[PDB]
Design a protein around this ligand. Structure first.
Ligand code: ADP
Ligand code: ADP
Ligand code: ALF
Ligand code: ALF
Ligand code: MG
Ligand code: MG
Lengths: 448, 133, 448
DNA sequence: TTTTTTTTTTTTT
């Protein structure tokens, strides 16, 4: 025998939950209706419950029992004991949403099974119906099933709805007077003029040739973000140990020659500065470091979710770097593996509504050209890195290639791509000794 | 079961028995082996500040001592505060069982001859504790 | 039927607690996995529990019962009664962490027994497998279990913890008056200044064109390191026989024209010098040479660990040279094969905490330029050689290219990369006759 | 068996 699906216990829980708290009435009502139940007495109880709610009567055991007794359905549904047992088996009212969702699923399956039986009945006996009519009934029934869903899957949306949401967003952006920095503050005012901060739900990328300052720049962004807001910032350092990263940060924030720090030849003033930096960092306590190696996209997402849940959300996450992550399922094709990683990082940003800064390496074809500034098509193994990214910043230090360059200690942030915004170049002073990028106070050179 | 764990916590941490409310108000037969637990609490209250070995020494000549020794060996937790919390929430669980048994009896009386307004109203109040969370 | 080691009670406590509470899911997710559970019913429940959790849904008896019912596993686990029974039996979930650990311990022990059974079975039935195959198989499994037990450390850490560890290390280095010698002493004054020795856990690279002084410089580092410490130094000479390597070193230390040694045309004074050198070397006895050809990264790791374990740590490792190692699995894609080799060498350095000096070779593109000094992008087949390396040193002798060069008998050590520290050039004197590099006592020329 | 995308080395015009 085949028993049509149903969840009596879930039906009990949904009925039981609302009697304690009625505030969740809309949640249950919109999700499910009295037609979703499989047992008739439960349908009677909910029908009574809806009537009482529509009458303004509070949803409770006493009101339900009174209504059933007056209507005479109390005997059919049981009584004080039966209705008391209804609430007794409810695990928690807060979960009622899942119980309601379960009830909807059981009803949907029952609806589908009934349609299948109706289709089988029509097919077995034409009853004068031709083949074409049987197709029409199947099409009509299928459309009804897709119609009864009431969306639940984000189908095509009219333009009137989209305009209402978009104009609301613009209006609220008007009120807050941030004056340029809509997203996370980068710390370099010349960079904010173009990027307007690191926007949430973005996949930012920082790329450059080895030993160009790729991890030095990203850490500067992380330090500035941590000190200029209150949300946690998460760092995935797959390339270097946590101690080496912190040794650089002390040198940058306290502006002490990192050679002394790494070697231990520190003076009194250097100890004073480092003590000052330590006090500030321990006052905020919103930086997290994870130096595990060869993480898969699943492990990255899981750990980021836990930090967000525990501390009320994330403000920024940095990955160092993209090509070191692994997808064991796709290991035969490196091109597919990199494409999968890039897609996952973009999806994670959307889910948590946070900017993701993922570093990347560059091809060697750059080094066979007369001009050695990077371009979009130099990203290593980059199938879709150029396509998924919403902003791409390249680090270029001309002094590395031409010894007699006039730009000695002047790095360039070349914005190679920006989906919503202009592109250009920004010049920053590079103090390698302190492992820092500073604002270029010198005369502004117009970008061509 | 949560019964065996209680004595194990009782034997391993004798001082926990000090904060145990009286149980003679209820029939000891309601729970299996409940009388012994109440026996231990009064025994602890008889000589407050007793060693763990002394507590088991009080029942050296009894046959049930073997069960007490096995429970002491089982579930050895170095932390003391966690054990106290486990004992406290467990004690709440037994009180829930007592109320659960009561309402089951009250349901039984309902089937026998029904209930009045006060009785079913009291039953309704008896469900909050079982759904306090 | 020996009883396999397992604890049902711990598993039941873990499963029941997770039913009671949802906030501890992370506590158990790291500690245990579905395969950890002994009985298949528990394995089915955990899999369903994980599927519900990663779907962002509440955990409860009703939800679990339906989810198991969907896959048809409801009856197999034991029916809804079993889950209701298990939920009843669980008082709370305070000590789940301990319960999770014991469950993890049992699986590992069971994993150990299975491996022992597999090795014993393989030995009883070699099936044509030689002794080497059995030994490698046994080593592989013990390593795999060892790695499995070493996955607990992973997890993001706050900044308070990282700051304490870093400051502690800086304090240690401050106490020691090493005066710039933080790692192994290279033996040359200028090189120590620019690098502070060879640091542990690094991957140094020495590169140059054929017959430039690449194995001559590496052996000098090995000799100088050996006399300036007391830990063993290991050499992997995949190119030359041990006798030829020892012939060169005996000429360098004793300062005797290596042609005389090679053809045995020595004198009494030369025999006096060689006798002195032999006495010193045998006094220390901390140099080991392995001239096997075509070693895979696993063989290099296996032999390095055995030396470290027997003699208590290794002070240095030398590989000559990088491109001669083999990875049979990746025998089709040369670029991937080299990338795997570089990744393994860096991992080996971190594990043993020893500086790994690996020689490489340069491209032919260097020789089509007007200027023939090496650059980073000249490393041969270098998928990732220039990316993983923490320090890169190039050897350049202008005399080889310009017969009228004023830099006769002078070698330039070009630091092409250094992750933590500056770059520049160092000048040494090349004595080919003695196969030696001597620190340059002539006038010092400023580096641009 | 076929089509696709990424690296690295050589030889020619
Ligand atoms: N003490 C120092 N003095 C001068 N330059 C330094 C010092 N420490 C590091 N640097 C330079 O900083 C640069 C950036 O290093 P890094 O950020 O690790 O590069 P990437 O991460 O892009 O590979 C390196 O090229 C290095 O030469
Ligand atoms: N007796 C000698 N007199 C002069 N030069 C020598 C003598 N022996 C070796 N050399 C030189 O030393 C150089 C370095 O050799 P080697 O280090 O083996 O090259 P590679 O860098 O390929 O290992 C060779 O190019 C050779 O010309
Ligand atoms: F040394 Al790198 F990116 F080349 F950190
Ligand atoms: F002789 Al070579 F690299 F050219 F060791
Ligand atoms: Mg880096
Ligand atoms: Mg050589």
């Amino acid at each position: 025998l085949k028993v049509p699906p149903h969840s009596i216990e879930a039906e009990q829980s949904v009925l039981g939950g609302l009697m304690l708290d009625n505030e969740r009435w809309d949640d249950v009502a919109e999700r499910v209706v009295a037609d979703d139940f499989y047992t008739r007495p439960h349908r009677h109880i909910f029908t009574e419950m809806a009537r009482l709610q529509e009458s303004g009567s509070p949803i409770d055991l006493i009101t339900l029992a009174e209504s059933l007794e007056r209507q005479g359905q109390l005997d059919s549904v049981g009584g004080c004991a039966y209705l008391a047992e209804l609430s007794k088996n409810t695990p928690s009212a807060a979960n009622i949403s899942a119980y309601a969702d379960i009830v909807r699923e059981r009803a949907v399956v029952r609806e589908m099974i009934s349609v299948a039986n109706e289709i089988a009945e029509a097919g077995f006996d034409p009853q004068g119906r031709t083949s074409e009519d049987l197709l029409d009934l199947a099409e009509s029934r299928v459309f009804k099933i897709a119609e009864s869903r009431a969306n639940k899957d984000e189908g095509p949306k009219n333009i009137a709805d989209v305009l209402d949401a978009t104009v609301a967003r613009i209006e609220q952006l008007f009120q807050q007077p941030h004056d340029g920095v809509t997203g996370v503050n980068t710390g370099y005012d010349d960079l904010n003029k173009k990027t307007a901060g690191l926007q949430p739900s973005d996949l930012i990328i920082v790329a450059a040739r080895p030993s160009m300052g790729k991890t030095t720049f990203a850490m500067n962004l992380v330090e500035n973000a941590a000190m200029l807001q209150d949300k946690p910032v998460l760092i995935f350092s797959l390339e270097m140990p946590s101690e080496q990263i912190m040794m650089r940060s002390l040198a940058s924030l306290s502006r002490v020659d990192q050679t002394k720090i790494r070697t231990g030849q520190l003076d009194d003033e250097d100890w004073a500065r480092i003590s000052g930096t330590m006090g500030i960092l321990l006052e905020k306590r919103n930086i997290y470091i994870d130096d595990s190696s060869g993480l898969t996209p699943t492990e990255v997402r899981s750990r980021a979710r836990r930090i967000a849940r525990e501390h009320g959300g994330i403000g920024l996450i940095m990955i160092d770097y993209l090509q070191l992550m692994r997808v064991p399922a796709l290991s035969d094709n490196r091109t597919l593996e990199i494409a999968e990683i890039s897609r996952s990082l973009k999806a994670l940003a959307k889910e948590l509504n946070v900017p993701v800064v993922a570093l990347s390496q560059l091809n060697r074809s750059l080094e066979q050209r007369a001009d050695k500034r990077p371009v979009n098509s130099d990203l290593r193994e980059s199938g879709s890195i150029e396509q998924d990214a919403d902003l791409i910043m390249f680090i270029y230090r001309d002094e590395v290639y031409h010894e007699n360059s006039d730009l000695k200690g002047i790095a360039e942030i070349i914005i190679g791509k920006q989906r919503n915004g202009p592109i250009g170049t920004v010049r920053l002073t590079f103090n390698g000794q302190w492992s820092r990028f500073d604002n270029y106070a010198g005369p502004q050179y117009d970008d061509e | 079961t949560t019964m065996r764990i209680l004595i194990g916590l009782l034997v391993q941490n004798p001082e926990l028995a000090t904060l145990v409310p009286p149980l003679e108000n209820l029939d000891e037969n309601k729970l299996p082996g409940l009388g012994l637990f109440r026996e231990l609490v009064n025994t602890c209250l008889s000589q407050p500040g007793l060693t763990t070995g002394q507590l088991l020494e009080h029942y050296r000549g009894t046959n049930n001592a073997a069960t007490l020794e096995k429970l002491s060996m089982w579930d050895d937790i170095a932390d003391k505060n966690i054990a106290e919390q486990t004992f406290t929430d467990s004690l709440n669980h037994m009180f829930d069982s007592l109320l659960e048994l009561r309402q089951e009896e009250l349901i039984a009386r309902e089937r026998t001859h029904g209930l009045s307004n006060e009785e079913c109203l009291e039953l309704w109040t008896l469900n909050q504790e079982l759904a306090k969370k």
